[PDB]
Amino acid sequence: HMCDAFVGTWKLVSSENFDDYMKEVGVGFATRKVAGMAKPNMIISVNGDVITIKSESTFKNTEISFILGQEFDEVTADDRKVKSTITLDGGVLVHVQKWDGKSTTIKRKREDDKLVVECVMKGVTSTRVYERA
Ligand SMILES: CC(C)[C@@H]1CC[C@@H](C)C[C@H]1OC(=O)[C@H]1C[C@@H]1C(=O)O
Structure with missing residues (x-):
């Protein structure tokens, strides 16, 4: 029951x-504009120790599978080649991406009936809210 409250199908609101x-x-610029228009559906599932997160939108369909704490290589939707590690820290899914000496973190947490996503790069934070589909 690792991640039970995250599992399901979610839509950006x-x-x-x-x-x-x-x-x-x-x-x-062009990627930002088309990606910023996207309204993804995020599908999270668990099978044993393996978590899979799918993001589906008119911009890009992505899928990552991973074990918590175990690094993996990821090609992001914007075509960065990153090394990623996803952990659970106090009930928050923490996804760190490292590439070219840079780092960014994407945190997912359940808050009421929502799944709130916080994206941080240096001093810049963005909040995205998802509801159940
Ligand atoms: C449209 C998506 C695929 C963008 C593409 C640019 C990239 C820098 C960030 C990437 O966002 C994400 O992975 C997830 C935080 C977005 C969310 O959960 O809604």
């Missing part, structure tokens, strides 16, 4: 500061 987050990460 609000975003704040996401263009600025993407700028800080280094995403180019």
Whole structure:
């Protein structure tokens, strides 16, 4: 029952500061504009120790599978080649991506009936809110 409250299908309902987050990460103009328009469905599932997160939108469909605490290589939707580790820290799923001497963190937490996503790159934070589909 690792991650029970995260599991399911979720739909984006609000975003704040996401263009600025993407700028800080280094995403180019055209990608920012099309990615910032996306309204993804996030599908989280667990099978034994393996967690899978799928993000599906008109911009890109991505899928990552991982074991908590065990690093993996990831090609992001904006085409960064990153080394990622996802841990559970006090009930928060913490996803760190490292590439080119940089780092960014994406935190997912359950808050009321929502799944709140916080994206941080240096001093720039963005909040995304998901509801059950
Ligand atoms: C549109 C998506 C695929 C963007 C693409 C640019 C990249 C820098 C960040 C990436 O966001 C994400 O992975 C997840 C935080 C977004 C969320 O949960 O909604």
